[PDB]
From a paper:
Here, we show the atomic cryo-electron microscopy structures for flagellar filaments from enterohemorrhagic Escherichia coli O157:H7, enteropathogenic E. coli O127:H6, Achromobacter, and Sinorhizobium meliloti, where the outer domains dimerize or tetramerize to form either a sheath or a screw-like surface. A shared feature in all four structures is the formation of symmetrical homodimers between the outer domains of flagellin subunits, with one outer domain rotated 180° relative to the other.
The asymmetric unit (ASU) of the S. meliloti flagellar filament consists of two flagellin conformations, which are identical in the core domains, but the outer domains are rotated 180° from each other resulting in an “up” and a “down” conformation. The D2 domains in the S. meliloti filament form dimers between an arbitrary “up” conformation subunit (Sn) and two “down” conformation subunits (Sn + 5) and (Sn + 11) as depicted in Fig. 2b. Since the outer surface is bipolar, a “down” D2 will also interact with two “up” D2s. These interactions form a 3-start helix surrounding the flagellar core, which resembles the grooves in a helical screw. For the S. meliloti flagellar filament, a prominent 3-start helix is created by the outer domains surrounding the flagellar core, which gives the S. meliloti filament surface the appearance of a 3-start screw. In positions with residue variations between FlaA and FlaB, there is support for FlaA at position 205 and FlaB at position 16 in both flagellins of the ASU. A different behavior is observed for the unidirectional flagellar rotation in S. meliloti, which does not require a change in flagellar waveform during run-tumble transitions.
Residue numbers in the entry:
A (entry chain P): 51 to 346
B (entry chain a), E (entry chain I), H (entry chain Y), I (entry chain b): 347 to 395
C (entry chain d), D (entry chain I), J (entry chain L): 2 to 50
F (entry chain A): 51 to 149
G (entry chain A): 199 to 247
K (entry chain D): 51 to 99
Write the structure that this text describes.
């Protein structure tokens, strides 16, 4: 009787997985359409770099392409869960697909789900905050990295300069874990790129602790926090977002900044598409495994 | 005008061919099931003999 | 196996549609030259021409 | 012989489903080229492409 | 760069054709085997005349 | 009478043997699934050993495959006795099937 | 590495830079002093010196 | 490597077909013999009537 | 030297074509005979029924 | 006859690949002269040239 | 019974023979590749004399 109940639960999970696979397929088709439109926009902008080419005609071209992008974003829905155009008021919206029905060893039953994140790189025109992958400005600088840090319980994105590991090790720096000390300056390895950090109690905003150190000979024992400040050498930002492109007399530098921002958005959108494809593959594998388990 | 009429009126025959094959298969299945439903009613004769 | 749907046939249909559109574009291109033949092409180059 | 289950039948069904999935994949491959699928194959090479 | 994309993305058609033929034959064998498995079940009736 | 009692015991042993065979079959199916997933992971990583390939995509694929491994490990349970994801704090646990 | 005027081929184990930097290693140019052991960089990998 | 895997793993289906036919015949014989063995125990009823 | 290598190595393709046709026919005959030999073992069932 | 592998098919594929590579090479040769390729042929003679 | 045990032993020997044949085929392919490379080396050197 218990095994028959578990088999019925597994059948229900298989139906839910089929529904989730349909949703993922629809969202990924929308993502491919967005990729194509963004590539066309980037090609048009690159062609617009020529000074002799009039910019008005390209202006309504990009206007039509932006309307097409909006139509792609809003139309690509299956059952109200479009996995796009999410509300980023909290900034941590998460959607899940029923993956498998698991009965624990100690007489417990639970349902496992596969999570997908729509934080800031797979949202496609955030409805309210207007801080999505599109309709937002991208910082464009040579030697910086855009890092997300939570302050007072709310996350934010800050642009800070990044330093290569080769320069750090050539300058004669002493390392410890994810922390470095080249001298009068200190660095923490929050991500694959090294960044200058403040000692402690400087911001006084309850920022996330980047790393903790110890004596280590000549290393001060303190809880280090990534420096929210320390602007790059040349802090340049995209003139307009992807959804607000207006190339009427911008100039060469503005055109280059817009092109770089468009390319960054395209790269992020391609990463999101790859993630969606990986999710679809995982759903297919999970469905096949659930079928095998039900047969067994 | 002729191009517009063709676009509004003509049919992309490939999916019609696909539908034709699908309906042939569906009719074959329906005929087989209908024959089975005709045949299965004769089982009762075993009891009375 | 479902006789009501054919995913492979649907993918083939989409591919055939793409090939047909590209072939029609190239057929117009080879018939009339004019790589920028209409405003449906690059509008700025068409206006300059 | 167990009259309510046929484990050989389930094995045959699993084989048929595996062959059907592989066949659908290879039909997509033969009909639209693309050794690397839309994004359901190795994502890194697709992104590079 | 286009040649590099072709090398990274394209598939040789001959190998796909061989796979398609092999999968068609495997599907035929699997269907025949499943039919044999289904026909195996009803042999028990001879015991119950 | 003693032989009849032994026959009843052997019938019970047969039922236990069937239950154990079902458990082992489920564990083996899950084991094959895990082996296939790990083979895919190894293939992806040896593809990614090249420096010309962005490693974020490979990292997310490996994360998905690790989640799949976790789901397979925790789901391949027949009747509680799953023969997988055991407690190794004691050092060694031995599962037995009535032979 | 040529011990003398004549060149020769030698095999030596390589150590990842992350492993050295994780354990609190001092660095200067192409030198590492994690602990009692001393590591140097020859072309791209750190080896025991 | 693929050829070696095939020669080590694949099966020459002809003898499997022969075995399948042989086992079908053996099963038919076994069912017939089992029916005979079940039926033959009714002969004793003649004495008591 | 190239002519000598060709004479020593090359094959007169006509007789290979003839052999290919002959072996196809022989394989067809062998398959038919194997099917007959597989089928003929079912004749024994008549006696026992 | 193994249904999952076809060694003759692999041999034919290897032959086809070799012929295709040689055909592409000779096509470049016949289309742009250059008995010595860009640099993929014997490097010394190309350098002298 | 002894002959059946011998038949099982010969089946094991057949499996071992298949494995050895695969090994020999791989080794021969490697040898052919090495011979071709060394022939190319000799041709280059006699050109460079």
């Amino acid at each position: 009787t218990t095994m028959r109940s578990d088999n019925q639960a597994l059948s229900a999970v298989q139906d839910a997985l089929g529904l989730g696979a349909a949703k993922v397929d629809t969202a990924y088709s929308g993502m491919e359409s967005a990729i194509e439109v963004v590539k066309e926009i980037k090609a048009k902008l690159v062609a617009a770099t020529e000074d002799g080419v009039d910019k008005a005609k390209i202006q309504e071209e990009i206007t039509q392409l932006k309307d097409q992008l909006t139509s792609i974003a809003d139309a690509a829905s299956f059952s109200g869960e479009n996995w796009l155009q999410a509300d980023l008021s909290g900034g941590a919206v998460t959607k899940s697909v029923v993956g498998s029905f698991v009965r624990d060893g100690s007489g417990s039953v639970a349902v496992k789900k596969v999570d997908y994140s729509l934080n800031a790189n797979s949202v496609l025109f955030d409805t309210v905050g207007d801080t999505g992958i599109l309709d937002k400005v991208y910082n464009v600088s040579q030697a910086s990295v855009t890092l997300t840090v939570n302050t007072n319980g709310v996350e934010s994105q800050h642009t800070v300069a990044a330093y290569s590991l080769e320069s750090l090790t050539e300058a004669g720096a002493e390392f410890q874990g994810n922390y470095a000390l080249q001298g009068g300056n200190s660095y923490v390895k929050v991500e694959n790129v090294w960044v200058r950090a403040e000692t402690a109690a400087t911001g006084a905003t309850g920022q996330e602790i980047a790393a903790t150190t110890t004596a280590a000979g000549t290393i001060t024992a303190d809880s280090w926090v990534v420096d929210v400040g320390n602007a790059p050498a040349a802090n340049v930002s995209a003139g307009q977002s992807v959804a607000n492109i207006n190339i009427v007399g911008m100039g060469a530098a503005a055109l280059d900044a817009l092109i770089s921002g468009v390319d960054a958005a395209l790269t992020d959108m391609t990463s999101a598409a790859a993630s969606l494809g990986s999710i679809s593959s995982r759903i297919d594998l999970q469905s096949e495994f659930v079928n095998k388990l039900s047969d067994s | 005008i002729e191009s517009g009429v063709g676009r509004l009126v003509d049919a992309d025959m490939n999916e019609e061919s696909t539908r034709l094959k699908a309906l042939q298969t569906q009719q074959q299945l329906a005929i087989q099931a209908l024959s089975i439903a005709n045949s299965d009613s004769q089982n009762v004769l075993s009891l009375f003999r | 196996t479902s006789i009501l749907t054919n995913n492979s046939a649907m993918a083939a249909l989409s591919g055939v549609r793409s090939i047909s559109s590209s072939m029609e574009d190239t057929q117009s291109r080879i018939s009339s030259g004019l790589r920028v033949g209409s405003a449906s092409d690059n509008a700025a180059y068409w206006s300059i021409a």
